[PDB]
Amino acid sequence: SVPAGAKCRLVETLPENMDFRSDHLTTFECFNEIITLAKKYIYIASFCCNPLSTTRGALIFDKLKEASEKGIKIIVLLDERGKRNLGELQSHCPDINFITVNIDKKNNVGLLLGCFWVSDDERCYVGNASFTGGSIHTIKTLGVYSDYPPLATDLRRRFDTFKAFNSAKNSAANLASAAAALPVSTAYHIKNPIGGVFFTDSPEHLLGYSRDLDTDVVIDKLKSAKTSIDIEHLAIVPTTRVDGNSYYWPDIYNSIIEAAINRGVKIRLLVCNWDKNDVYSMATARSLDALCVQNDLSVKVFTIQNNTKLLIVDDEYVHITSANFDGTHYQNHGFVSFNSIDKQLVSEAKKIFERDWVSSHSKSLKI
Amino acid sequence: SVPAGAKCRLVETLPENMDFRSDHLTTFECFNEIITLAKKYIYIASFCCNPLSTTRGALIFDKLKEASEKGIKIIVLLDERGKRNLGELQSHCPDINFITVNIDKKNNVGLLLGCFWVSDDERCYVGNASFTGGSIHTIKTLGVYSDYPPLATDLRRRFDTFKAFNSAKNSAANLASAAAALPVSTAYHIKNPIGGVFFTDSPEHLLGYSRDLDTDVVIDKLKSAKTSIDIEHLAIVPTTRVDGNSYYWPDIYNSIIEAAINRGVKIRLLVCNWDKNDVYSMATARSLDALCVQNDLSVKVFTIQNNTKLLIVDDEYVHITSANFDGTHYQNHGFVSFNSIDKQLVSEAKKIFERDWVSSHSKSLKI
């Protein structure tokens, strides 16, 4: 028999300067358990790699340094734009195999946002706590830990698809034939969960034929919302700025409004504050301001460093990821998202959203 | 051989209290020519029927009264919500067959917005000048007249589909079997124009299998815009209010923004002013205000009574109709739209839009 929830428990970073308190596992405690119980390998992936920026991040980097010196195969994947610290990371850990990743060499837009750990095909972490000292110590994060082998092995297959994109000779990033010979395998998806948990992937040109697009799954869960929509992300502005040109993409921005106006869904949004010089964020904020007074919608903002990417629908489906709901992320960026329908696991996630909604850092939307 | 433009020339209403001037045919001159040259029948359709509200409208109603007394079969289609004047219209013209129409008895939402004339299968008018004294004399309108038999006959087939929906015993409005036996025929569409002119229809449950949806054709022409988008409609607010509940529909609202931001299309919009008490119109206006300063977009408003529904794309495609770009109209309301790609006919339409854009009634968008 398979366990309910796939042995998943919540993991988050709650800095001391913030009022967030919980009994769940912490991100610092989570990374120590993965390195301690490691016997075969430790595979880590994130956008930027910089553990030495805080105290707790350096201790995790020392435990990973000691693990690499005992025979554990350590491979760290980072986007080629976090290449500044590469000379610093290799100088402190010569046994750790640092690999730069460029998943999109056709247009140089897709970034490696896969934020997850995996070890021995048994234990794994996934969330938005990137391999940075801030995301371990000073930046609020939110993730999930599970010691279930079948769930960690399916996340390891996500690592194999991302590892092939290396800026070194002929590979999945340089050849079109070596990239088509990639086994893009997934053991579980929205049509076959494991313990009520499944992974959604991104972008579309890296799904193959079996994996499900995270864009289609999130939109379907938002269009199928009946009672409540709770989102804690960076921003839900439908317009992003790639290079020096603005990009418009309101797919997520419309499926949420379709729930509040047409279906009367009680929606609560918790995004960051916005630049007053950004006309796309001011117009988006004033558009949401007229909806809170006309429908059952509520918006609060915060100014702290928080990478939390949370989505809860009808207290029945939860969605934790590292990418933000926008056009640039769900069209080009590569990442893996956590999807679960376990009522007990969603209830603990609803407990976290209610904590952050009434927190002192969450001031009401004022324009 | 077939003539270019299908013998089409512009027709509009330019009241004396307004500064609009042109050498084209007027709506009052257009209705006199149709009644004078009538030999077989005159079929008229609009939402509300009230010709006696102005001077020119009463003269058209007298010419139509004299035509009905000579043997011309006069059938007037009006929506069952314009039934107030029905006792007045029949009292002045007993020989004219007035018919109330309810195209949607399933939900009582679809309204008869078909605004067109047709006579002898030879001459026909189509636009937004409804059968009202205002739309002939005091309300600015815009339409097209053509004495081409094949184009008028295809518009008569639109009248046959609308006439079947009568609130009288068993018919297309009462029976589901008598409504399926309806010949829903079109001779020309977007895949087969006549002289560069074709009709698009609405709603979707009245198209059959041959007619093209006006919603799909307009969105495709907006998504295929390369240089310019010129629209003169009532309003492009993505939210409408059906009954006492708001309805959200941004399909047209998004395809236009996709052109200005992603494709850099120079777009000029001329809509009416909005109620300051309407939060959906204020948020929509402030959203457009931040786009005019960030992209090549310009918006002007007017307060006069104007039913003009115009759409020009890249000076190559023109779209004149009676319904407004919104959710309630293109989802439920029944109407026929004028579509033409004739360069000479679009050039005359571009001449009209430039006149209304710099007119004194078109004040710049101020918030």
Residue numbers in the entry:
A (entry chain A), B (entry chain A): 6 to 372
Wording from the paper:
F13 is a phospholipase anchored to membranes via two palmitoylated cysteines located in a hydrophobic membrane-interacting region (MIR). Tecovirimat is an inhibitor of mature virus wrapping widely used to treat mpox patients infected with clade IIb strains. Tecovirimat binding to F13 blocks viral wrapping, but the structural mechanism is poorly understood. We showed that F13 forms a homodimer on membranes, and tecovirimat inserts into a cavity formed between the two protomers.
We also assayed one escape mutant (G277C) identified in vitro but never reported in mpox patients. The mutations identified in the clinical MPXV strains were located at the homodimerization interface and were expected to have an impact on tecovirimat-induced dimer formation, whereas G277C was located further away. Consistently, the mass photometry assay showed that sF13A295E, sF134MUT and sF13ΔN267 did not form homodimers in the presence of tecovirimat at the range of concentrations tested, whereas sF13G277C did as the wild-type protein. As controls, we generated three additional viruses bearing substitutions in F13 known to confer tecovirimat resistance: rVACVG277C, rVACV4MUT and rVACVA295E. As expected, all the control viruses could be rescued and grew to high titres.
